[PDB]
Every structure is written in structure tokens, then in C-alpha cells.
Design a protein around this ligand. Structure first.
Ligand SMILES: *[C@@H]1O[C@H](CO[C@@H]2O[C@@H](C)[C@@H](O)[C@@H](O)[C@@H]2O)[C@@H](O[C@@H]2O[C@H](CO)[C@@H](O)[C@H](O)[C@H]2NC(C)=O)[C@H](O)[C@H]1NC(C)=O
Ligand SMILES: *[C@@H]1O[C@H](CO[C@@H]2O[C@@H](C)[C@@H](O)[C@@H](O)[C@@H]2O)[C@@H](O[C@@H]2O[C@H](CO)[C@@H](O)[C@H](O)[C@H]2NC(C)=O)[C@H](O)[C@H]1NC(C)=O
Ligand SMILES: *[C@@H]1O[C@H](CO[C@@H]2O[C@@H](C)[C@@H](O)[C@@H](O)[C@@H]2O)[C@@H](O[C@@H]2O[C@H](CO)[C@@H](O)[C@H](O)[C@H]2NC(C)=O)[C@H](O)[C@H]1NC(C)=O
Ligand SMILES: *[C@@H]1O[C@H](CO[C@@H]2O[C@@H](C)[C@@H](O)[C@@H](O)[C@@H]2O)[C@@H](O[C@@H]2O[C@H](CO)[C@@H](O)[C@H](O)[C@H]2NC(C)=O)[C@H](O)[C@H]1NC(C)=O
Ligand SMILES: *[C@@H]1O[C@H](CO[C@@H]2O[C@@H](C)[C@@H](O)[C@@H](O)[C@@H]2O)[C@@H](O[C@@H]2O[C@H](CO)[C@@H](O)[C@H](O)[C@H]2NC(C)=O)[C@H](O)[C@H]1NC(C)=O
Ligand SMILES: *[C@@H]1O[C@H](CO[C@@H]2O[C@@H](C)[C@@H](O)[C@@H](O)[C@@H]2O)[C@@H](O[C@@H]2O[C@H](CO)[C@@H](O)[C@H](O)[C@H]2NC(C)=O)[C@H](O)[C@H]1NC(C)=O
Ligand SMILES: *[C@@H]1O[C@H](CO)[C@@H](O[C@@H]2O[C@H](CO)[C@@H](O)[C@H](O)[C@H]2NC(C)=O)[C@H](O)[C@H]1NC(C)=O
Ligand SMILES: *[C@@H]1O[C@H](CO)[C@@H](O[C@@H]2O[C@H](CO)[C@@H](O)[C@H](O)[C@H]2NC(C)=O)[C@H](O)[C@H]1NC(C)=O
Ligand SMILES: *[C@@H]1O[C@H](CO)[C@@H](O[C@@H]2O[C@H](CO)[C@@H](O)[C@H](O)[C@H]2NC(C)=O)[C@H](O)[C@H]1NC(C)=O
Ligand SMILES: *[C@@H]1O[C@H](CO)[C@@H](O[C@@H]2O[C@H](CO)[C@@H](O)[C@H](O)[C@H]2NC(C)=O)[C@H](O)[C@H]1NC(C)=O
Ligand SMILES: *[C@@H]1O[C@H](CO)[C@@H](O)[C@H](O)[C@H]1NC(C)=O
Ligand SMILES: *[C@@H]1O[C@H](CO)[C@@H](O)[C@H](O)[C@H]1NC(C)=O
Ligand SMILES: *[C@@H]1O[C@H](CO)[C@@H](O)[C@H](O)[C@H]1NC(C)=O
Ligand SMILES: *[C@@H]1O[C@H](CO)[C@@H](O)[C@H](O)[C@H]1NC(C)=O
Ligand SMILES: [Ca+2]
Ligand SMILES: [Ca+2]
Ligand SMILES: [Cl-]
Ligand SMILES: [Cl-]
Ligand SMILES: [Cl-]
Ligand SMILES: [Cl-]
Ligand SMILES: [Cl-]
Ligand SMILES: [Cl-]
Lengths: 507, 507
């Protein structure tokens, strides 16, 4: 009897545009193969659709209103409370805990040291080539180098001759090889960068998605019923040279159709590129015979809009921005243990037109939240599940605000039917800082309820000095029905009275 | 080590107009003395403010939408499911279970046998003199007999020379004396009739409340903001001779001021009369030395309006109609065990101007529901608490839809902050059957949420054939704030958006 290892894979800005989530266009064979042996959650949502707030949230197991982190300019241990993290908890239980890539958000939100010395057994590894993502590293048709958003590259024509996710994969494999020697179990967090912007990927992956076979989003127009307060102006992508040359109006655009399809091409190519890296990582896990002793959690910190509602990027409460993939492989529970010389995660080449997305593994339609990642991994690994947090929990160091999802591997509280998301705004009209408002400039907080049936959102007055929401100062509301309006194009909040919330509360 | 006895006292139509609930006018010294040794719940509410629906609810531990009993014309075991009752459960655990007075509602709702043979050890006792309550038994100033609503009587001038609650008290005492012999513990349910109409009580109690020192209700007018659908026309009291002679308009009245004060006099007198009966019962319990081995639960099936909002009687979702008293005496837990020859419930005479309401015993402001009576008594008595019901539970015989209140004797689910009530209507405009609509005539169901902060009610379309509420067909709504509008005179539903419900759902 031993304790199970944990491989936590985090992808930056990855929406569930994956074969195992019903996407019949994107080629993600390696991730789909992971799902075939795993429990896949169809309705998992981040608590805020932006990096640091989401990562600090699900790494401490607390919600944004407990971390009080809505931008990226505060360290929770000083700002809110001495909250323990997932890797800190495993390390305190005899694990060797290791970080590769973007797990914590860099900077002050992790005290510039990836939350040292609490979380990790040694100073994390961050790939060097990431610092060239936003340099003049994209060679164009006429031979010059540019800082482009769409950046298919020959690896032999970029600085250091590599890409950050290839480095992370390589380093993760070496650490896996090392841990096969150690007597201690490992908790390995690998944080991949793509498909986060810019879309810098080996140019060969672009051939998987010719533009002729690329369509726009189903709902590229800005909906009439979308209140301006809920719109994010996607300002960061406007700074890239190729985007800047199109002279796209602020804040509503639209992006020219031809470039919209090019964005979707490069995003899809980056996903398939990401998928091969995951393939290499999981394949090495198989070769090392760790598949029967290692939990594998695969998820993302938030989604990314690709033209839906005339929106791009995250910074939103729409499903496209909050819906994330969430897959859990548990040796001998989500699948039969691998027998003699059996391989569960053999590398699959997206350039091979074969098979049929494999079969969908276990699936769950329950509404779940990233803030449940902490208790789930602690339970799946055989450790003590931290207790439920009181309200408030600024003074508690080890507790969880999310539910454990272990029951899903074999009394109806209404909150178990809800995935919560939120996002701040500095004003009602989209302006320069509406994507990523700093704490002092937040004046509105949009709180959103997502059920199997609808998304209910209210944009309410917010006081950043007292961290106080005023649910009597509702600036605007949104109500989208999954059955009739899955794309969320027809806001029904004005025609509503609140009977949907009453119904949810009524036993 | 032994099991504790249970004395469950139920009062028909008793609102918390009691000294131990802050009423500085009504004299209820014996009940207040029970409270001084008990845990008193300040915010307990029935699930529907009318007899059979409420009694079948809290006796089976299920809600009205599980019993599907909204009138008094169906037996749950045939109509909904083979639901077990509190006394049935105790009897199955070696208790002698006994019923005196109105515990179950008589008629088909209890199969005309008080739910025989499941609930009781022998056919219950019902006082004979109750059948004279609605006869010409009230002697008037000119010497004739009338069927009056206000019925102060000399006991020597009524049929059989007694009153139903005196008989019940006497019979309960005899059963207590008998059980002091038995080796088995007892579960004794005593159901008192007054202050249910008519107000027939020993006329001496009328002297405790001279009319000069009687005021009207604080809010005797019908509020402008009260939707007609939520108004009950109080038709039953209009049939009494003294009421009929005033020629009170239907359905809004008002009742003449002088008669309003007379109603309140007779109600208060009936409460003090009830209190002495409780005094006799509890005093006999003390004399028999059962105070250290007997749980005592005191409550009511619902309230009664005394002019608030121009309303009278129950059939309502207002606090006055749904708020009930709820007191739990637990030997050695809510108070120190009685030592040698100590008496905890000595009879107190309301005609003695002495003391000062005693001291308030333990108190709890948590919002609780009568449907929690089943699990609480089962726990307090040392028995296994039935499990929480699934949804739906028509097929389950033993389970509870309410929470156990044992924690109150030494994760925040929003439903633990709510007491639920409801009431049906046959139409929006008050009509002949708006007080007590029969199932087939129900077209609207008013669902109400009560928190520490507000009461939120929606009157929605209801289909009695499918037992289906349509929360998209809201006929009207109500929102009353406890802090600013404790009397519930200023409906704020039209100025509201639903942010109060959202706030309750948001962790
Ligand atoms: C913040 O907490 C860390 C570690 O918390 C540990 O785990 C918690 C679940 C709880 O059990 C704590 O009591 C644990 O200490 C603190 O780091 C410890 O600091 C003490 C002295 O300050 C030191 O002796 C320990 O070795 C440290 N342990 C670790 C794992 O680093 C830290 O001090 C806390 N910070 C504040 C400001 O309270
Ligand atoms: C947050 O980090 C600071 C600084 O971390 C130090 O410097 C980094 C570059 C890196 O090398 C870390 O490993 C270092 O610990 C912490 O402030 C330092 O705390 C130590 C106490 O161990 C003290 O000796 C130093 O003087 C401090 N440095 C400064 C500039 O004040 C700080 O404690 C960390 N916050 C928390 C909550 O742990
Ligand atoms: C929380 O909000 C309430 C309500 O906000 C008001 O109504 C909104 C629709 C919008 O018009 C706001 O600008 C309004 O202020 C605030 O209640 C107001 O309080 C002020 C000052 O006390 C008073 O002058 C107004 O009359 C109040 N309005 C109402 C409708 O009650 C309340 O002040 C806010 N609380 C905090 C702490 O900011
Ligand atoms: C309705 O239930 C009664 C009693 O239910 C009992 O308690 C429940 C918690 C559960 O444990 C049941 O299995 C128990 O029986 C049934 O009454 C019993 O009926 C059987 C034969 O029908 C008889 O042998 C038992 O002695 C009866 N027990 C009692 C206490 O009366 C009754 O049959 C059920 N009715 C229907 C229609 O299902
Ligand atoms: C509901 O009650 C009826 C009738 O109860 C009988 O008659 C009463 C006056 C009283 O004396 C009760 O104790 C009697 O049991 C039940 O119908 C009877 O069921 C018995 C089976 O025990 C059968 O022999 C009789 O013929 C039935 N009588 C009639 C008129 O049909 C009925 O079973 C009870 N319902 C439930 C769910 O228990
Ligand atoms: C449940 O209620 C909806 C909504 O009720 C409608 O709106 C109310 C304000 C009131 O005006 C009602 O009379 C309305 O019917 C019902 O939806 C309606 O369904 C009918 C028939 O399918 C259709 O003709 C209407 O256009 C619908 N109206 C809306 C606003 O959607 C629904 O039918 C009810 N469900 C059941 C089972 O009765
Ligand atoms: C929902 O209703 C609100 C208000 O009822 C609408 O916002 C109003 O828009 C008008 C212009 O048409 C302005 O003059 C008002 O000042 C606005 N009201 C407030 C409170 O700001 C909103 O446009 C409606 N939305 C939809 C989709 O119909
Ligand atoms: C997981 O599977 C591998 C290979 O299938 C197992 O490898 C064995 O490991 C033990 C010690 O861990 C060695 O003594 C054996 O020689 C290895 N090979 C075989 C064929 O057993 C590994 O033990 C498995 N892990 C667990 C926890 O059962
Ligand atoms: C709350 O609003 C509703 C509707 O907005 C009011 O009901 C309306 O009353 C008018 C008469 O003033 C009728 O002509 C309408 O037909 C009613 N509407 C509906 C949907 O029936 C209601 O009176 C308002 N209540 C308060 C207290 O202001
Ligand atoms: C409750 O108190 C009474 C009197 O204070 C106790 O009465 C005793 O009962 C036992 C058997 O039940 C007799 O043997 C004694 O003679 C009785 N008198 C005394 C003074 O003990 C009674 O036992 C108490 N009940 C419990 C459960 O402790
Ligand atoms: C688009 O897909 C179809 C279906 O396989 C394929 O035949 C066609 O060649 C694709 N388009 C291009 C430009 O390759
Ligand atoms: C961009 O467009 C605006 C008007 O839409 C025009 O005034 C401006 O000169 C344009 N800029 C460039 C660089 O084309
Ligand atoms: C009303 O109460 C006061 C206060 O005790 C008392 O003095 C007065 O006599 C009472 N009224 C009547 C009519 O007795
Ligand atoms: C009752 O009052 C109505 C008018 O308010 C009148 O028509 C009727 O005759 C009165 N009935 C009696 C019995 O006084
Ligand atoms: Ca991100
Ligand atoms: Ca009653
Ligand atoms: Cl990194
Ligand atoms: Cl170029
Ligand atoms: Cl596409
Ligand atoms: Cl009776
Ligand atoms: Cl007379
Ligand atoms: Cl009064």
C-alpha cells in the first residue's frame, strides 16, 4: 500500500475546443486519449476569467472574495490570509512538489518566488524562451521579424532555437525520470503557455487548419441585449503589429472577417501543438511505468473568446470565457490498471488521419468549479481532505471553499447545482482598463450564477476599499437559457422577475 | 441508562402572543415558566397556515408538496406515499404512544381513525364537549342561547358541564399516572383546541382583559401594496350570530372597531385559559416526578391574524399566520435536573399580579420549520434520526425533509437560513373559497421565503392535476423587510429586481 503520485497539467487560456468535448474540428488526439481513461467534466467553470485571480483561487482552494485578488497586484498571504496551497499541502504530507512552467502567476501575486518556501521543494523551472514570445520573433512573408499575434515559426529561426512549452515538456520528463528513483511520491505541476497569445507554434501545425475549411463564430455580431458593462474591449491583442495594421475600431470592432478566421486558425494550431506536448509528457509517463501510480489532472485557468458576441480573449462571464476543460485520470478507478507492458498514453500524431476521436470515457454533467481542485486532489491522493471553510475564512490557513468531487468516481444543496464566476469593471462603458481593472479602479463587480439550465448575472456596485458588493445597486443583468440559447445571444433578464432564482431555492 | 419520555403539546391556532415571546399584555405564566427551563425558538414557522395541511406535514416530517395535502380531503398514505409519522416511529421503538385531543386533523386526512393502526397504541381520546362548541351554547345578556364567536361561559350553563380542553387535560393526567406504572416510555400528544374559534372559555378569564386596556392592531388597514391574490376573506367567522349581526362587508370589511377589540379580548382570554390547562398538565407532570425523564415540546399548527392588514384568521403567508411558538424542554440539557422534591412547573394563577414574566430561558433566532419536529424529537429522545429524504420521496416511508435542531442545544446551506411557507388560492380576487380552496379548485400557489431579513413571496400558477407550479406565470409578488417593515405593511416587490435572492445564493 502506497500513496499515488499527482501530475497536474494546467494550460493557459485553453477553452474546451477539444475532440473529447465534442469539437469535431480541432485535432487533440493525445488529450482525447487521456480522457478515454479518465472522468471528464462537461460543465466545469473558473471563478474569474483571468490568470492570477483564477490561479490563486484554485491553488488555495478559496474563492476570489476570500483571496480578494481581482487583478494581479497583491499577494494573498499578506493581502487576505495565510492560505495554504495544494502543493504546500502535499509537500507537508511527504511529497516532492515541483513546478514547471506557468503554474502560479508570476510577479507579486506569488511574491515573485512562486510562493516560496511554502509550496515547492525547489525553486520552480520557468522556460527561458518564453521571454521571446513578445519580441520581434515572427518572420513575415517579406523576410522581416515582427511581434505578431499570428506567429507560425520555424524553430530554427527563433532565439535559442526552441519554444517555452517544448522546454517545459523536456524538463518535466527529466523530473519524472528522477522521481522514478526517489522513495517519495511526487506532485508535479506543469503549466503550458499556448494557446495563450501570441500564437507562436511550429508552423507545420498551421497546415492542419487550412483557411478554406475555417468558419467564423456562429454569433460574430455584438448582441443587442448585451449591456455595455458586460462587454470587454480586448485591448491587449490590439497592440500586436499585424492586428494594429488593420485599424480596428475601439471598443466594438469588428475584426475583419479574414483576420477572424486567421485568429481561429492560429488558435486551433496552437491547441494541436499543445496536444503534442501533452502527448510527449504522457507518453514518457507510460514508458516510465508510472501510469498505474499517478493521478493526472488536466485543466485550464480560463477560456478564450474567438469572435462569439463580437468578443475576443477572456475578461468575461460568458461561457466561452469561463468554461474550462477538466479531466481526472485515477489509476485503477477511471480505468483498469495497465497490465504487463501495456501503454495507456502512447503518443499520437495529429498528422495521421486515423481513428474517430476514440470513445468518450466516463463523463459527468454536474456543475463543478476550479475551486474544488484542492479538495479533489487531496482526496484522490489518499490524503486528508481539508475541512470546509467558515465564512469568512481570512483567519484560517487550511480549508476549502469548494466541494470534493470524489463521489463522482463511484441533501440537495442548491449551491451544488451552481458554478460561480465573476469579473470586475471600472465603469459601465467599455474603456481602456475594462479588461483588467486594478483594484482601486474597480467600481462594479459582475456576479454570475451558472446552472444546468441558465446563466444568471448581475453587475452590481462594488466598493474596493471595504470589499463590499451592493446588491441593491444593480447596474445591469443578464439571463441566458442553455436549452433555447446555448450560444447566449438573447438576454432575457429584462423580461424576468427572479422566479428562476426562487425556484432554485425552493426545495 | 433509559430512554426519555415525550410530551408533545399542540395548540390549535395559537400565535406567539405569549409573555415569553415579548407580549407584555397576554398573561401566560405557566407557558412562560416552561420556557424558562427550555430552548425557545423565536423564528419558527409552519409550512401552510391551516390545520390539516400543517398537521399532516409536521407529523410525517414531509413538506406540503410531498404530502400533496393543501386542503383536508385526502389521506396521505393513499394520496402521496406511505409516509411514517412521529408517533408511529416512537411506537416502533418500544414506546406507548397516545393521542389526546386534536393532534391529527379529524376526517379523511387521517382516515377517520387518527391514522390507525400505525400511529397510536390505542384509539385516541377526543373530548366529547367539543361537539357543543358550534351549538347554541353561549348565554347572552338577555338570557338566550347563541352560537357566538365571543363565548365567555359559566361551565354550569353549558352541555355536559365542561369544556373540551379541560377534558383533554384531565385525561392526559390520568394517562401520565398510568404510565408511571409501565415499564415502557411514553409518547403523549395532547392537542388543545382553544384559542381556535369559537372563543368559548370560562368567563372569569375575560376579566383579565378589560376593553379599556385593549388596543387595535398596529396596522388595521388593508395595505395598498397588498395584492388581492394574497388576501384571505375570513369567511368562517362571518357565520357566527354575533358577527353576522354587524353586517360586515365582504371580503374586505372592516370589522367595527368595538368588535375588533372584543375579538382580541376573547382571543387573549382563551390564551390565558389555555395557559392554565397547560399549567395543570405540567404541574401533574411535576407531582408525578416525570420532569427529569420527559421531553416537552410545545408548539402550534399555525397563527391567527387579529386585524393586522385588515385580516383575520389564518389562510395566509403573513408572519401573523405562519409564525408559531416552539419550545423544547430537555431534562438535564435545557435546565439542571430537578433535585430532591424540586418542582419545575408549579401551577401559576394568571389572577395573581406577581413576578415579572420570569427570566427568558435559552433562546435561538435561527429560522426553523415545523417540518423539523419529527427529526428533532427522534434525536432528543435518543432514537435514530431518520435519514434525509430524496427528491421526490413519495416512494420512501421513513425519511425527513427538515433538519434536526439538536445542534442548537450544544457549510452554510442557504436553505438553513429559510423557513418555507405556502398557501393556495382559487383566483386572484378574493371569493367564497379563497380561505380554504379544494384541491381541484386551486389555480394559484403562493410560495414564500422567510429569512432573518425579509419575507419573499411569489403567487404562481399552479396545476392541481399534475401538482406542478409554473414559476414563469407569476401572478403577483411580495417583499417585506424585517428591519424596516416588521409589521409587513409596505410591499417592496415591484421596486425589487431579485438581488436579495441572488445575494442569498452567493457564498
Ligand atoms: C503561514 O503558514 C506557514 C505554514 O503553515 C503551516 O501549515 C498550516 C496548515 C498550519 O498547520 C500552520 O500551523 C503550519 O505552520 C507558516 O510557516 C511556518 O512558520 C513557523 C514559524 O513562523 C516555522 O517554524 C515553520 O517551519 C513554518 N512552516 C512551513 C511549512 O513553512 C508561516 O509562519 C505562516 N505565516 C504567518 C504570517 O502566519
Ligand atoms: C516575500 O518575499 C520576500 C523576499 O524574498 C526574498 O528575496 C527573494 C528574491 C528570494 O530570494 C526569496 O527566497 C527571499 O526570501 C520576503 O522578504 C524577505 O524575508 C526574509 C525572511 O526569510 C528576510 O530575511 C528578508 O530580509 C526579506 N526581504 C526583504 C526585501 O524584505 C517575504 O518574507 C516574502 N513574504 C512571505 C509572506 O513569505
Ligand atoms: C447601496 O445601494 C443603495 C441603493 O442604491 C441606490 O439605488 C441605485 C439604483 C442607484 O441609483 C444608486 O445610485 C442609489 O444610491 C444605497 O441607498 C442609497 O443611499 C443613499 C445614501 O445613504 C441615499 O441618499 C439614497 O436615497 C439611497 N437609495 C435607495 C434607493 O435606498 C446605499 O447607500 C448603498 N450602500 C452603500 C454602503 O453604498
Ligand atoms: C405502510 O407501512 C406500514 C408500516 O411500515 C413499517 O415501517 C417502515 C419504516 C418500514 O420499515 C416498513 O417496512 C414497515 O412495515 C406497513 O404496515 C406493515 O404491513 C405488513 C404487511 O403489509 C405487516 O406485516 C406489518 O406488521 C405492518 N407494520 C405495521 C407497523 O403496521 C403497511 O403495510 C404499509 N402500507 C403499504 C400500502 O405499503
Ligand atoms: C382506512 O380505514 C379503512 C376503514 O377502517 C376500518 O373501519 C374504521 C371504522 C375503523 O374501525 C378501522 O379500525 C377499520 O380498520 C380501511 O379499510 C378497511 O381495511 C380493512 C383491513 O384491515 C378491511 O378488512 C376492511 O374491509 C376495510 N374497510 C372498508 C370499508 O373498506 C383502510 O384500510 C384504511 N386505510 C389504510 C391505508 O390503512
Ligand atoms: C408556464 O407559463 C409559461 C408562461 O406563461 C405566460 O406568461 C404569463 C405571464 C401569463 O401571461 C400566462 O398566461 C402565459 O401563458 C407558459 O408559456 C406560454 O405557453 C403557451 C402555450 O404553450 C404559449 O402560447 C405562450 O406564448 C407561452 N408564453 C410565454 C411567455 O412563454 C407555459 O405554457 C406554462 N406551462 C404550462 C405547463 O402551463
Ligand atoms: C432593460 O431595461 C433597462 C431599463 O429598464 C434598459 O436601460 C435603459 O435604457 C434606456 C434607453 O433605451 C435609458 O434611457 C435608461 O436610462 C436605461 N435605464 C437604466 C436604469 O439605466 C435596458 O436597455 C434594457 N435592456 C434590454 C436588453 O432591453
Ligand atoms: C506499476 O506497474 C509497474 C510495472 O507494470 C510495477 O513495476 C514493479 O515495481 C516493483 C516495485 O515498485 C518492482 O519490484 C517490480 O520488479 C516492477 N515490475 C513488475 C513487473 O512488477 C509497479 O510495481 C506498479 N506499481 C504499483 C504501485 O503496483
Ligand atoms: C406592481 O406592478 C404591477 C404591474 O406592473 C401592478 O399591476 C398592474 O396594475 C395595473 C393597474 O394600476 C393594471 O392595469 C395592470 O394590468 C396590472 N399588471 C398586471 C401584470 O396585472 C401592481 O398594481 C403593482 N403593485 C404595486 C404595489 O405597485
Ligand atoms: C427522576 O427523579 C425521581 C425522583 O426525583 C426518581 O425517582 C426514583 O426512581 C427510582 C426508580 O426509577 C426509585 O428506585 C427511587 O426510589 C425513586 N426515588 C429516588 C429518590 O430516587 C427517578 O429515578 C428519576 N429518574 C431518572 C431516570 O433518574
Ligand atoms: C475541407 O474538408 C474536406 C472534407 O475532408 C476536404 O475534402 C477538403 O479538401 C478540405 N478543404 C481543403 C482546402 O483542403
Ligand atoms: C484608421 O481609420 C480612421 C477612420 O476609420 C482614419 O481616420 C485613420 O487615418 C486610419 N489610420 C490608418 C493608419 O489607416
Ligand atoms: C389599565 O392598566 C393600568 C395600569 O396598571 C391600570 O391602572 C388600569 O386600571 C387599567 N384599566 C382598567 C380599566 O382597569
Ligand atoms: C346590510 O347593509 C346593506 C348595505 O350596506 C343593506 O343593504 C342591508 O339591508 C343591510 N342588512 C341588514 C340586515 O342590516
Ligand atoms: Ca490565463
Ligand atoms: Ca388550526
Ligand atoms: Cl513560465
Ligand atoms: Cl516581412
Ligand atoms: Cl471554425
Ligand atoms: Cl378532539
Ligand atoms: Cl340573549
Ligand atoms: Cl391589545
Amino acid at each position: 500500500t502506497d500513496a499515488l503520485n499527482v501530475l497536474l497539467i494546467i494550460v493557459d487560456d485553453l477553452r474546451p475546443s477539444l475532440g473529447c468535448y465534442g469539437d469535431k474540428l480541432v485535432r487533440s488526439p493525445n488529450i482525447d486519449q487521456l480522457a478515454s481513461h479518465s472522468l471528464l467534466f462537461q460543465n466545469a467553470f473558473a471563478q474569474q476569467a483571468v490568470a492570477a485571480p483564477s490561479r490563486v483561487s484554485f491553488l488555495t482552494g478559496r474563492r476570489p472574495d476570500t483571496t480578494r485578488l481581482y487583478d494581479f497586484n497583491s499577494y494573498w498571504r499578506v493581502h487576505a490570509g495565510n492560505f495554504s496551497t495544494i502543493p504546500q499541502y502535499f509537500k507537508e504530507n511527504g511529497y516532492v512538489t515541483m513546478s514547471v512552467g506557468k503554474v502560479f502567476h508570476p510577479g507579486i501575486s506569488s511574491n515573485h518566488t512562486d510562493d516560496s518556501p511554502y509550496s515547492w521543494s525547489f525553486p520552480p523551472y520557468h522556460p527561458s524562451s518564453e521571454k521571446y514570445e513578445n519580441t520581434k520573433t515572427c518572420r513575415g512573408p517579406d523576410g522581416e521579424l515582427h511581434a505578431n499575434l499570428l506567429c507560425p515559426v520555424d524553430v530554427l529561426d527563433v532565439p535559442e532555437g526552441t519554444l517555452p512549452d517544448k522546454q517545459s515538456t523536456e524538463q518535466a520528463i527529466q523530473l519524472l525520470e528522477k522521481m522514478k528513483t526517489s522513495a517519495s511520491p511526487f506532485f508535479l505541476a506543469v503549466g503550458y503557455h499556448k494557446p495563450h497569445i501570441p500564437f507562436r507554434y511550429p508552423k507545420e501545425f498551421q497546415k492542419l487548419y487550412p483557411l478554406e475549411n475555417i468558419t467564423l463564430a456562429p454569433d460574430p455580431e455584438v448582441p443587442d441585449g448585451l449591456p455595455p458593462v458586460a462587454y470587454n474591449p480586448w485591448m491587449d491583442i490590439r497592440q500586436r503589429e499585424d492586428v494594429q495594421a488593420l485599424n480596428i475600431s475601439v471598443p466594438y470592432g469588428p475584426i475583419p472577417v479574414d483576420f477572424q478566421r486567421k485568429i481561429r486558425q492560429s488558435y486551433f494550431a496552437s491547441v494541436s501543438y499543445l496536444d503534442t506536448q501533452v502527448g510527449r509528457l504522457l507518453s514518457a509517463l507510460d514508458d516510465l511505468q508510472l501510469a498505474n501510480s499517478t493521478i493526472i489532472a488536466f485543466t485550464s485557468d480560463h477560456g478564450w473568446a474567438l469572435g462569439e458576441h463580437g468578443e475576443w480573449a477572456k475578461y468575461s462571464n460568458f461561457d466561452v470565457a469561463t468554461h474550462v476543460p477538466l479531466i481526472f485520470y485515477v489509476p485503477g478507478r477511471t480505468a483498469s490498471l495497465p497490465e504487463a507492458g501495456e501503454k495507456l498514453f502512447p503518443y499520437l500524431d495529429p498528422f495521421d488521419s486515423a481513428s474517430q476521436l476514440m470513445e468518450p470515457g466516463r463523463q459527468s454533467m454536474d456543475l463543478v468549479e476550479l475551486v474544488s481542485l484542492f479538495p479533489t486532489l487531496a482526496g484522490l491522493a489518499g490524503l486528508q481532505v481539508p475541512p470546509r471553510c467558515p465564512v469568512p475564512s481570512f483567519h484560517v490557513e487550511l480549508c476549502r471553499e469548494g466541494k470534493n468531487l470524489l463521489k463522482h468516481f463511484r441533501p440537495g444543496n442548491p449551491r451544488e447545482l451552481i458554478a460561480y464566476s465573476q469579473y470586475p469593471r471600472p465603469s459601465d462603458i467599455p474603456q481602456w482598463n475594462s479588461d483588467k481593472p486594478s483594484l482601486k479602479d474597480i467600481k462594479i463587480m459582475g456576479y454570475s450564477i451558472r446552472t444546468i439550465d441558465y446563466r444568471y448575472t448581475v453587475w452590481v456596485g462594488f466598493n474596493p476599499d471595504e470589499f463590499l458588493a451592493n446588491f441593491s445597486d444593480i447596474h445591469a443583468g443578464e439571463l441566458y437559457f442553455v436549452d433555447s440559447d446555448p450560444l447566449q445571444d438573447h438576454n432575457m433578464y429584462n423580461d424576468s422577475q427572479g422566479g428562476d432564482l426562487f425556484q432554485l431555492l425552493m426545495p
